[PDB]
Amino acid sequence: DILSSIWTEGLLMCLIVSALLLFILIVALSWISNLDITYGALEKSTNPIKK
Amino acid sequence: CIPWLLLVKPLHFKFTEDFGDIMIHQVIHTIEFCLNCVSHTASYLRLWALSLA
Amino acid sequence: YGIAQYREINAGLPTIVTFPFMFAIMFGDMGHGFLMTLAALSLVLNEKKINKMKRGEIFDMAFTGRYIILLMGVFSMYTGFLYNDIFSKTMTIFKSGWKWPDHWKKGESITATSVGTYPIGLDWAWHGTENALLFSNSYKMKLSILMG
Amino acid sequence: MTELCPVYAPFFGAIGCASAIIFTSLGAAYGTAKSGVGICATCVLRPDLLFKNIVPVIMAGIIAIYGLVVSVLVCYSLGQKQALYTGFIQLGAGLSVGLSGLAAGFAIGIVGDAGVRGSSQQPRLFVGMILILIFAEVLGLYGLIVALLLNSRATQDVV
Amino acid sequence: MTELCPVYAPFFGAIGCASAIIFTSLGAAYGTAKSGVGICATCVLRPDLLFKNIVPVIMAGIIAIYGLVVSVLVCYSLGQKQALYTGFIQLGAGLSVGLSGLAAGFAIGIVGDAGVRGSSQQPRLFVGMILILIFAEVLGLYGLIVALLLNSRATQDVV
Amino acid sequence: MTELCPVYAPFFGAIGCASAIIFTSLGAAYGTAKSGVGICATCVLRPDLLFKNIVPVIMAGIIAIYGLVVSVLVCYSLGQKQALYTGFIQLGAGLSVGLSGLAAGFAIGIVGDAGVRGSSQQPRLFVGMILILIFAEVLGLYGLIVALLLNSRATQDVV
Amino acid sequence: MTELCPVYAPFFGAIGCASAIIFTSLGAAYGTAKSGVGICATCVLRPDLLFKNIVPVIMAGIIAIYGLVVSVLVCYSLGQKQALYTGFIQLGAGLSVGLSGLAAGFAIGIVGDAGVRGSSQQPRLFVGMILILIFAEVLGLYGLIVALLLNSRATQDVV
Amino acid sequence: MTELCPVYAPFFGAIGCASAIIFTSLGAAYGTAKSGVGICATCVLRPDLLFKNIVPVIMAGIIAIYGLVVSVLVCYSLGQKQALYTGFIQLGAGLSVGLSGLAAGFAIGIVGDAGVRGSSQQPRLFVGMILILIFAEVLGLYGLIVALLLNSRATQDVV
Amino acid sequence: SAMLHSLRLHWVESMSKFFVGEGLPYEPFAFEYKDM
Amino acid sequence: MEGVYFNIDNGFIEGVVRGYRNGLLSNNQYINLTQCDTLEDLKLQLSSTDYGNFLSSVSSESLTTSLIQEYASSKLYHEFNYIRDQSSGSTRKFMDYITYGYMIDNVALMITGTIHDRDKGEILQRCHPLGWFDTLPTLSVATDLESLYETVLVDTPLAPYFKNCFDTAEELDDMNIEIIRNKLYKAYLEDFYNFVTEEIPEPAKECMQTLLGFEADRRSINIALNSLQSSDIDPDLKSDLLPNIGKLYPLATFHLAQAQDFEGVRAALANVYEYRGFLETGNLEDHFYQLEMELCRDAFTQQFAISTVWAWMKSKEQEVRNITWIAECIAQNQRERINNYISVY
Amino acid sequence: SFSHFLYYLVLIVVIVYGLYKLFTGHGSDINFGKFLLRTSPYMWANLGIALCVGLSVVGAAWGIFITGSSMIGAGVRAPRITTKNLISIIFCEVVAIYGLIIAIVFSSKLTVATAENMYSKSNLYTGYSLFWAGITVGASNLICGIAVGITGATAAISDAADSALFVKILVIEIFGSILGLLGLIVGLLMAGKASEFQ
Amino acid sequence: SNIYAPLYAPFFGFAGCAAAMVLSCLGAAIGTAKSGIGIAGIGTFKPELIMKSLIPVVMSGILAIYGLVVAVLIAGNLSPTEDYTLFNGFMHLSCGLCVGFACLSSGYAIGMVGDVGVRKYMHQPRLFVGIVLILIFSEVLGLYGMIVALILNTRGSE
Ligand SMILES: CNC(=O)O[C@@H](CC(C)C)c1nc([C@H]2OC(=O)/C(C)=C/C/C(C)=C/[C@@H](O)[C@@H](C)\C=C(C)/C=C(C)\C=C\[C@@H](O)[C@H](C)[C@H](OC)/C(C)=C/C=C/[C@@H]2C)cs1
Ligand SMILES: CNC(=O)O[C@@H](CC(C)C)c1nc([C@H]2OC(=O)/C(C)=C/C/C(C)=C/[C@@H](O)[C@@H](C)\C=C(C)/C=C(C)\C=C\[C@@H](O)[C@H](C)[C@H](OC)/C(C)=C/C=C/[C@@H]2C)cs1
Ligand SMILES: CNC(=O)O[C@@H](CC(C)C)c1nc([C@H]2OC(=O)/C(C)=C/C/C(C)=C/[C@@H](O)[C@@H](C)\C=C(C)/C=C(C)\C=C\[C@@H](O)[C@H](C)[C@H](OC)/C(C)=C/C=C/[C@@H]2C)cs1
Ligand SMILES: CNC(=O)O[C@@H](CC(C)C)c1nc([C@H]2OC(=O)/C(C)=C/C/C(C)=C/[C@@H](O)[C@@H](C)\C=C(C)/C=C(C)\C=C\[C@@H](O)[C@H](C)[C@H](OC)/C(C)=C/C=C/[C@@H]2C)cs1
Ligand SMILES: CNC(=O)O[C@@H](CC(C)C)c1nc([C@H]2OC(=O)/C(C)=C/C/C(C)=C/[C@@H](O)[C@@H](C)\C=C(C)/C=C(C)\C=C\[C@@H](O)[C@H](C)[C@H](OC)/C(C)=C/C=C/[C@@H]2C)cs1
């Protein structure tokens, strides 16, 4: 009455835990990759009319 | 007491359009107070949380 | 937060004590409390000189609340004494209310028996004990609920 | 390998020791990066605020400290023959601290950036930012705490 | 193949030896690339700062030194008949240094780019960037540490 | 559990009770939302048309009434020991009415938005919108007919 | 459950009965929606054309008639103990008609929108749109012919 | 169910009968839609070309006839006890024809749109579009042919 | 952190109970050194 | 939803922009300005607004309507450029897109001055600062578009918008400048509409589509009415100037392209119901400005939208105009038309 | 899209595997029931407790950033709102404290079961109950926090626009802040009849 | 013991509970958040219209009451010492799906209608009544998922 020889309950538990973790990591890395530096405050203006 | 807090003061004002404002304020205050008892009792567990940490 | 209504109960008078003591509950360590007390005393005892000179925004805020921090440190010392926590360690001033078994072997799980109640503060018997956290959590949850 | 203590039980606890630091260091890095971007944008105009707009970058690091604490506590409860219950508890304790720290960091960053950008204009806002930041930080704390509680059960009454 | 030491246990160890250096190098490359872009953008105007805006590229490379410290240590504890617990510990240690050094490198790159861009205008900002960068570079350290303190348990008390 | 009536047969019929109401409400909500957006955009200029540009919201609602008619008919034919054929029939009826109502509700929403926006300018367009909306509504009725003609076979001649 | 007639054979007949009306309604809804958008855009200027630019919405509705015909015929041939071959045939007929109607309806929506928009300017174009729309309808009729020729074999010569 | 003729062999043939008409209709619908959009855009200026810019729609239609030729042939060769080899052959023929027709219909739509748009300006371009459309249409033919030459082997020399 | 969670327990949990607020701050007309 | 991801980058931007909005002069403040008897009184009254001490460095004798306009506009542009200095990613691209129109306007002002031999200093003073690019003063060297593009505008963000301006003759004059300026605003508006549709999320995608459709419609109507004055222009050439993103497109824009008289424009606008009475009576410019203010007000009812940066810049830009107008009626003493200050907030 | 392509590939692989097992007579080999029965209830309980706390925190943090970022922007010109709208940030942080509370209550049921009484009716029920109650509390608190933060940002901007507006938007927050409470309640009802693992 | 009541059947009943509560809360939060963004937007113009414009948030909350009721009913029928059929668990999984997704749809429609009407009837005060009608129609969508859920509970226990 085993679930499977390859996909044992322990292996499936490990895999679903790792999948939850990898999904979280993917979300976090997507969010971090969306980090865009606000350059406008980092470069100097060059406008004679103003600034 | 929930009906008490909700009704006694606005009804006293009615019996002596402003009554509408009084009733609205009393309803908001009662909901806020009833939720705040629980949310304030749970919040003071931050004392334990920060002490433990 | 806001300006009190005219002739309304002022929240500063009660905060003088309640804001430092609620902090102390959240802090509860005689070591850190003593360090903070000394930091506040440095400003308080030299309050005239610091007032005369110019101060930065953060330093100005710290100096203005110098008595705040003094009270926070004193109450933190008191609470840490009640928590028996000095730099994460415990003091053994009083006889403990727990007696460990007369004899045991190395690595043997031993449980203590209640022979009394610690006079002031948490008994040092459950320092470094496996279940210490279970008692500390219960006590401090209930303490926070009651105080709040 | 016992019924209650399979050979794969240490898998979950080691993934929890890792998850705690990896996700509290993801959140802390996000917070530090965004707060530093804000600090670099503001201190061009207002360098005098720099050693006082560092607070968000100090709070994000405290998130990483909360998961270095849960990781080190979970790593010393890890064993070759430690029960599957202990492994699940250690995974849960790292999932909690790591995710809560990620959320707290992500919020610390977004809120520190806003508050440093606005404090260069309204100094009175510094108090507002620090108060909104102490509530983003407490989230992480709440994770650590849960994690800590989890570890208080991980190895106890376990066969 | 023993119950406790299957033939596939070295898989996780070898995946950790890989992951540590892999993710630390990814983070270090990200940081070096962005910091170098900032340095090239600034030193066009301010070459005199170049040999002093190289700090983020140094701090990003300490992330890869941390991943090489864990890969080299995980590698010397890799064995044909090493326990599955040891393999899981060696995977957690690599993921800890690797994914905490990825985050630190991302933070280092962003902060260094911002700080080199702003330091060409406000020199006093360079010290703020160095503090913000020590807080980012700290994250990676923590992962190394949790990864070290996981190798201290990898082979020990293991049958 | 019989060969023909496994314990998991009620799963499919239950997914059909859900599919009927999950999708007919999704379509009806889409239609009601877009038609209401159009009505709010138009009635700012033409409030007198309001009670009469409500037709697309009434039409989108009959899409949800169609999946309530199938969900309630499918739910009164469900059973602990009901055949797998009956379960598949009840899943196919719920899918039929739910999908056909989703499509009809999408068409109803788009057409109603367009027709309310255009009817505030050309009143003669209203009858044209009603007809194009009757054609879109019709698609949900065809799904209800196939779902109702599937329940006529769900429990019948079944062992 | 026979070798040739498993308990799960009715699964593919019901999915084909559902697919027959689910995809034909999706295509018809797409066509009706886009044609109605075009009709509402044009009839603001040219209401007199409305009861004659409704053709794409009538042509996109014959797509759903094609899936009601196959859904109704596939469903009266469904059975608890009907062969797996019959189930596969009823799935292939429902896929054939639904997919072919989906494509037809998409073409009928795009072409009808374009032709109603252009016919308000060039009336001679209406005949061209009706022709391109007859071609789009044949794509659906061809799927109905394949689906109707698949059901002619579904239950026949089947044990 | 024989070794060579499982009960699931008809599954492939039915997916092939459906795939042949499903993808050839998808391609034909794409081609008809885009060519009709082009025809509606051009015939506003040049209605006289309309009954002669219909060629791409007539060419995209032939893509669907090719899928109907393969679907009707694949279906008359479907059987309850037909070999798995025959099922794979009927799936391969249906895939062949449908995919080639999809590609041919996409090419036909794009080329026909471009050529009708350009022919309203340069009539001499019409012959070039028919030449490029003959080439796009022969991509579908070559699928049909491969499909045909796959059905010539589907039922033959099969036990 | 603990100083600022004490502030919320005072501003939100303590002063929510009795503090009406919305008063007029006392800013009497006084001369003060104004720095350029 | 709009709120979930909007505040990760644009929360502070929207808060500050909405704070700027709250400072928009209301009708009562405009009336108070109207009652001012002098530019000194106008400055004092404006000091009570969020303009504040913006003229505090200006002496009494130096107060002029031109100076007041310059200072208010400089305040607006400094606010805009700061908000850009706090924005990143898609928002930076959006705010850069807002500047590309001012750049097209400056390119025409610069080249129009170069062909009239006017001093480059005055021509550059009159140029819109938001529309500044490093090589803008270098447009004061050449006359033919070929040299100007191959030497200056290829490196500018306006380069993609030079794909239909090469047809005209090498010799360049005022009519050719107007043609080039309309072609550059057609290509720009189409590019800014595409950028909004693909990258700018909803409901700032819809708000910015509506506000660019209005811009395109106004440009088309103005182009048609200006071509009316000219003896005749090829309708195909006109169609190359009318943007293809507005409510007018493709029917009303077409009819305007082939329109050859004022009644033709009126017939073209009759079909579209949003511009019915614009040409019926009144001042067309005032009608357009009122519609723009109404559209911007509507963009402020939608939070978690970067359409509010555009709606604040165009609202504030109207405010400045209004102030200038009032200032004129105070400086020149013609107070009969002082109340035509178009107020919506 | 790479993500959409991966989703489609996973769906196709799952469908093909299911059809292969079903046709070959091994449809029952994909036994979700056996997976649930044999997977340790400890995993379900601990995942529930971790996801409860984590998702409650995620929503709290997500709301705090939405409210916090809009308060800071609006307080540049109207700093008076900073303390007034801070109640919004307390409605966002209160969901987290609910999750924490639930974790504490649910962690009390994380006892150690005996080897024989491990996959029993009570222990499997306790695992499912604490997994799904934690999921419910965490997701409800996530939604409530993100929604209350979106309302708090609107309230902060309105307060900056006009003070009188705030009290009217706070009501909406009070409407949203209850949604986590309900989840909390429902969680307590799910894990109500659950018992410590025995 | 009972093959028709396997020990994993409570997993499905608790999945239904979670679906009900979480998805109804998601609808009520999409409704109260999106409708609330419409009430704050108008606040800058017609602050006086905000208190009457709370019908959309009140209606969105009733969607999380439809899911609380269903979840409470499902949880009252789940016990570790009671024989829960796998049929009762499927029937409580559909209850959850039925109420949660119906309330999600109702909440999306209520957020979309409330937001735009509130932001729209600033100019036209007569539009408001219509909003209340449309908001009713959307709200009914959730009710229907509740009702079907109730019927599915009455049949799961029986
Ligand atoms: C990918 N390229 C790469 O590998 O670069 C190679 C060079 C190649 C081009 C050949 C590198 N050589 C180095 C050498 O040091 C340096 O230049 C400098 C200035 C080091 C001083 C710095 C910046 C110190 C910061 O960390 C501190 C304040 C950060 C933290 C958190 C605080 C602590 C207590 C952590 C300390 C550890 O970080 C420690 C320092 C690290 O322990 C493993 C270590 C001993 C790295 C190797 C450094 C060499 C000597 C760095 S990079
Ligand atoms: C989203 N909230 C929601 O659920 O709304 C609920 C609750 C509300 C009170 C809030 C609704 N109650 C109703 C009631 O009717 C009406 O107002 C009106 C005017 C109905 C007439 C209409 C428009 C008929 C069109 O379909 C026709 C031409 C379309 C087609 C294709 C032709 C046929 C032969 C189809 C007929 C079926 O459509 C039939 C009619 C339907 O059979 C199931 C039915 C009896 C629905 C319930 C109607 C009630 C009385 C509508 S909405
Ligand atoms: C979107 N909702 C929806 O479902 O609407 C429903 C319900 C409505 C009452 C609301 C619809 N009822 C109808 C009714 O007919 C009509 O009005 C008209 C004018 C039909 C004539 C048309 C246009 C014929 C075109 O196809 C021809 C030239 C196309 C092709 C390729 C050539 C051939 C040989 C194909 C023929 C089949 O197509 C045949 C025609 C179809 O065989 C199944 C059939 C007899 C449908 C029933 C139509 C009814 C009478 C249409 S739509
Ligand atoms: C939408 N779906 C659909 O079916 O529309 C129906 C619409 C009606 C039901 C209303 C259609 N009826 C037709 C009829 O053809 C025509 O008018 C004409 C003049 C077709 C001539 C064309 C253009 C031939 C091109 O292919 C040639 C040059 C391309 C190539 C590479 C060369 C070769 C050797 C390929 C030949 C095959 O293409 C062959 C021809 C095809 O063999 C299967 C066939 C006999 C199709 C049916 C045609 C009918 C008579 C087309 S569309
Ligand atoms: C956030 N989550 C949450 O808990 O909300 C709490 C939050 C607050 C404590 C702050 C809420 N308390 C309430 C209370 O109601 C009200 O104020 C008002 C005015 C209710 C009248 C309304 C608008 C009725 C509409 O539905 C009608 C026209 C819609 C339809 C389709 C038709 C019918 C026949 C309605 C059937 C059910 O809808 C029924 C009415 C509902 O049965 C379950 C019910 C009795 C809910 C609870 C209401 C309380 C008293 C609402 S929100």
φ and ψ at residue C86, rounded to 5 degrees: -125, 110
Q: By CB neighbour count within 10 A (0-12 exposed, 13-18 middle, 19+ buried), where does G81 fall?
A: middle
Q: Scanning the structure block, which residue is given the tokens 């998808």?
A: H26
Q: Which residues have CB under 8 Å from J112's CB, separation 6+?
A: J174, J177
Is there a domain that residue K198 lies in? no
Counting the structural domains of chain L, the total is: 1
What is the C-alpha to C-alpha distance for residues K57 and D105, in angstroms, rounded to an integer? 11
Pocket of ligand 5 (CB under 6 A): B 31; K 174-175, 178-179, 182; L 28, 58-59, 61-62, 64-66, 69, 136, 139-140, 143
Residue C99's DSSP bridge partners are C113
Q: Which two tokens stand for residue J199?
A: 């990258």
Pocket of ligand 2 (CB under 6 A): F 28, 32, 58-59, 61-62, 64-66, 69, 134, 137-138, 141; L 136-137, 140-141
What is the C-alpha to C-alpha distance for residues J232 and J110, in angstroms, rounded to an integer? 27
- What is the b/e burial string over J305-337, where b = at least 16 CB atoms within 10 angstroms of the residue's CB? bbbbbbbbbbbbbbbbbbbbbbbbbbbeeeeee
CA geometry: angle G8, G10, G13, nearest 5 deg: 130
What is the C-alpha to C-alpha distance for residues F111 and F57, in angstroms, rounded to an integer? 11
Are the Cβ atoms of I9 and B36 closer than 8 angstroms?
no
What is the C-alpha to C-alpha distance for residues L158 and D64, in angstroms, rounded to an integer? 53
Residue H48 DSSP symbol: G
3-state SS record for chain J = CHHHHHCCCCHHHHHHHHHHHHCCCCHHHHHHHHCCCCHHHHHHHHHCCCCCCCCCCCCCCCCCHHHHHHHHHHHHHHHHHHHHHCCCCHHHHHHHHHHHHHHHHHHHHHHHHHHCCCCHHHHHHCCCHHHCCCCCHHHHCCCCHHHHHHHHHCCCCCHHHCCCCCCCCCCCCHHHHHHHHHHHHHHHHHHHHHHHHHCCCCCHHHHHHHHHHHHHHHHHHHHHHHHHHCCCCCHHHHHCCCCCCCCCCCHHHHHHHCCCCHHHHHHHHHHCHHHCCCCCCCCHHHHHHHHHHHHHHHHCCCCCCCHHHHHHHHHHHHHHHHHHHHHHHHHCCCCCCCCCCCCCC
Other beta carbons within 10 angstroms of residue B1's beta carbon come to 8
Q: Which of F32, F35, F62 to mutate to test the pocket of ligand 2 (most atoms within 8 A of CB)?
A: F62
Residue minimizing CA distance to atom 16 of ligand 2 = F58
φ and ψ at residue C113, rounded to 5 degrees: -115, 140
One-letter amino acid at K81 equals: I
Is K76 within 8 Å of J19 (Cβ atoms)? Answer: yes
H or E segment to which residue L70 belongs: helix L55-75
Which CA distances in Å does E135 have to B23, J130, J205? 53, 38, 39
End-to-end CA separation in angstroms for chain J: 28
Interface list for A 10-39 with D (CB within 8 A): 10-11, 13-14, 17-18, 20-21, 24-25, 28-29, 31-32, 35, 37-38
Residue E45 DSSP symbol: T
What is the C-alpha to C-alpha distance for residues F113 and F107, in angstroms, rounded to an integer? 10
Total residues belonging to chain L: 158
Residue minimizing CA distance to atom 31 of ligand 2 = F138
Q: What CATH number is associated with residue K18?
A: 1.20.120.610
Q: Which of D52, D148, D149 sits opposite C58 (nearest CB)?
A: D52
**What's the gap in Å between F26 CA and the centre of ligand 5?**
21
Is H6 near chain K, with CB under 8 Å?
A: yes
Q: Which two tokens stand for residue C74?
A: 């004193």
Distance, CA of J250 to chain centre: 23
Q: What is the DSSP string of G72-141?
A: HHHHHT--TT--HHHHHHHHHHHHHHHHHHHHHHHHHHHHHHHHHHHHTT-TTHHHHHHHHHHHHHHHHH
Minimum CA–CA partner of F61 in chain L: L137
Torsion angle defined by CA atoms of residues C109, C113, C119 and C123, in that order, rounded to the nearest 10 degrees: 10
What is the C-alpha to C-alpha distance for residues E108 and E126, in angstroms, rounded to an integer? 14
Chain D neighbors (3+ CB pairs < 8 Å): A, B, C, E, I, J, K
Is J155 within 8 Å of J214 (Cβ atoms)? Answer: no
Is F62 within 8 Å of F104 (Cβ atoms)? Answer: no
- What is the b/e burial string over D21-34, where b = at least 16 CB atoms within 10 angstroms of the residue's CB? bbbbbbbbbbbbbb
φ and ψ at residue C143, rounded to 5 degrees: -60, -45
Enumerate long-range contacts of J162-166, CB under 8 Å, 24 or more apart: J162/J187, J163/J187, J164/J240
Q: What is the DSSP string of chain I?
A: -HHHHHHHIIIIIIHHHH------------------
One-letter amino acid at K82 equals: T
Is L92 within 8 Å of L74 (Cβ atoms)? Answer: yes
Is K62 within 8 Å of K153 (Cβ atoms)? Answer: no
Q: Which two tokens stand for residue D62?
A: 């405290």
Which CA distances in Å does C59 have to C55, C72, D124, D126, J159? 6, 17, 15, 14, 53
What is the C-alpha to C-alpha distance for residues F71 and F19, in angstroms, rounded to an integer? 8
Q: Scanning the structure block, which residue is given the tokens 């090589």?
A: J135
Is K135 within 8 Å of K52 (Cβ atoms)? Answer: yes
Residue C113's DSSP bridge partners are C99
After which residues does chain I become discontinuous at a C–N distance over 2.5 Å?
none
Q: Using alpha carbons, select from J21, L28, L14 the residue that is nearest to residue K192.
A: L14
Which CA distances in Å does E106 have to D20, D117, E32, E120, H48? 19, 21, 9, 22, 64
What is the C-alpha to C-alpha distance for residues G60 and G33, in angstroms, rounded to an integer? 10
One-letter amino acid at D156 equals: Q
Is E46 near chain A, with CB under 8 Å?
A: no
Check if F138 has its Cβ closer than 6 Å to any atom of ligand 3. yes
Where in chain D are the domains? Answer: 1-159
Is L149 within 8 Å of L96 (Cβ atoms)? Answer: yes
Q: What is the resolution of this structure in A?
A: 2.8
What is the C-alpha to C-alpha distance for residues D134 and D108, in angstroms, rounded to an integer? 8
What is the C-alpha to C-alpha distance for residues L94 and F72, in angstroms, rounded to an integer? 12
Q: Which two tokens stand for residue J284?
A: 């067309």
Interface list for L 56-115 with F (CB within 8 A): 85-87, 90-91, 93-94, 97-98, 101-102, 105-106, 108-109, 112-113
Are the Cβ atoms of D114 and J85 closer than 8 angstroms?
no
Distance, CA of F130 to chain centre: 18
Residue G159 DSSP symbol: -
Q: Using alpha carbons, select from J230, J149, J166, J156 the residue that is nearest to residue J188.
A: J156
What is the C-alpha to C-alpha distance for residues D87 and K43, in angstroms, rounded to an integer? 9
3-state secondary structure of D92: helix
Residue K122 DSSP symbol: H
Task: Suggest the residue from K157, K163, K169, K173 to mutate for an interface test with chain J (most J CBs closer than 10 A).
Answer: K157
Give the domain extent around K153: 6-191
3-state secondary structure of D149: helix
Q: Using alpha carbons, select from J265, J253, G129, G33 the residue that is nearest to residue H44.
A: G129
Cis peptide before D56 (omega within 30 of 0): no
Is K106 within 8 Å of K133 (Cβ atoms)? Answer: yes
Which atom of ligand 5 is closest in space to residue L59's alpha carbon? 23
Q: What is the DSSP string of chain C?
A: --PPPTTPPPSHHHHHHHHHHHHHHHH--HHHHHHHHHHHHHHHHTHHHHHHS---HHHHHHHHTHHHHHHHHHHHHHHHHHHT-BTTB----S--SEE--S---TT-----EE----SSSS-GGGTT-TTHHHHHHHHHHHHHHHH-
Q: Scanning the structure block, which residue is given the tokens 């977004």?
A: D110
What is the C-alpha to C-alpha distance for residues H19 and J216, in angstroms, rounded to an integer? 47
Give the domain extent around L139: 1-158
Ligand nearest to the CA of G100: 4
Q: Which two tokens stand for residue K140?
A: 């409800």
C28: left (phi over 0), alpha (psi -120 to 50) or beta: left
Which is it for strands C98-99 and C113-114: parallel, antiparallel or unpaired?
antiparallel
Is B46 near chain I, with CB under 8 Å?
A: yes
One-letter amino acid at H129 equals: M
Whether the CA torsion L103, L106, L111, L115 is positive or negative: it is negative
Residue A45 DSSP symbol: P
φ and ψ at residue C114, rounded to 5 degrees: -75, 110
Q: Using alpha carbons, select from H107, H125, H133 the residue that is nearest to residue H42.
A: H125
One-letter amino acid at C71 equals: L
Cis peptide before J203 (omega within 30 of 0): yes
Q: Scanning the structure block, which residue is given the tokens 């340095």?
A: E39
